[PDB]
Each structure stands twice: as structure tokens, then as C-alpha cells.
């Protein structure tokens, strides 16, 4: 959040200006690149339970 997600800091700055002492990750767009890229080859991402 401090140095990666362009959405991470926006989605969090608009809340620290309101005040809330704790954050949440989200989804790094960088991964979204590598992720789909390997999809063209034939690789599966899996998150269960």
C-alpha cells in the first residue's frame, strides 16, 4: 500500500483523512499482468477455503 498499489494508496488515503488506524491489501495490478500473461500459456491460479 505504501509503495505499489496505485489504487491501494488512493483507496486508503481517502480514509486516513477520515481516520482509521489499520489497512487492507487489495489486489496488486502488477500481479494482474503476470497472471493473465501465463493464462495465455495455460496456467491456473487457485485459492480455496
Amino acid at each position: 500500500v505504501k509503495s505499489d498499489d496505485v489504487n491501494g494508496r488512493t483507496k486508503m488515503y481517502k480514509n486516513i483523512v477520515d481516520g482509521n488506524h489499520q489497512m487492507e491489501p487489495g489486489m496488486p495490478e502488477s500481479f494482474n499482468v503476470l497472471l493473465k500473461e501465463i493464462r495465455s500459456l495455460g496456467i491456473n491460479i487457485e485459492l480455496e477455503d
Partner: protein
Amino acid sequence: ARVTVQDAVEKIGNRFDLVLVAARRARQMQVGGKDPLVPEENDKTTVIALREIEEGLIN
């Protein structure tokens, strides 16, 4: 002000899950939850949580 919080470190030894506790606690003192019992004095809620650990009443 605090100069040594070694006391907090001993009441709850995790020093990690300890941060998750006060995490949800700061949430209560902000988004609804419950009001801070100890009448605060300039100290943000993060430090207020620090003090509650030293007393060991909320963990």
C-alpha cells in the same frame, strides 16, 4: 508520554498478534464499537491501546 513500553511487551508476548488485537480495538473506538473508557489526553487511540495493554484489561 511513554519512554518504555517493555511492560506491554511482557503482558502479551506475541508482539504481533498484539498489534492485531489493538487493530480491531482501534476499529471499535472509531467505527461504532465502544467508547474509550480511560479519558484520553491528546494521545491518539493507538497509544490509548498501548496503555490498556500495560494495565492488561483488554487483550
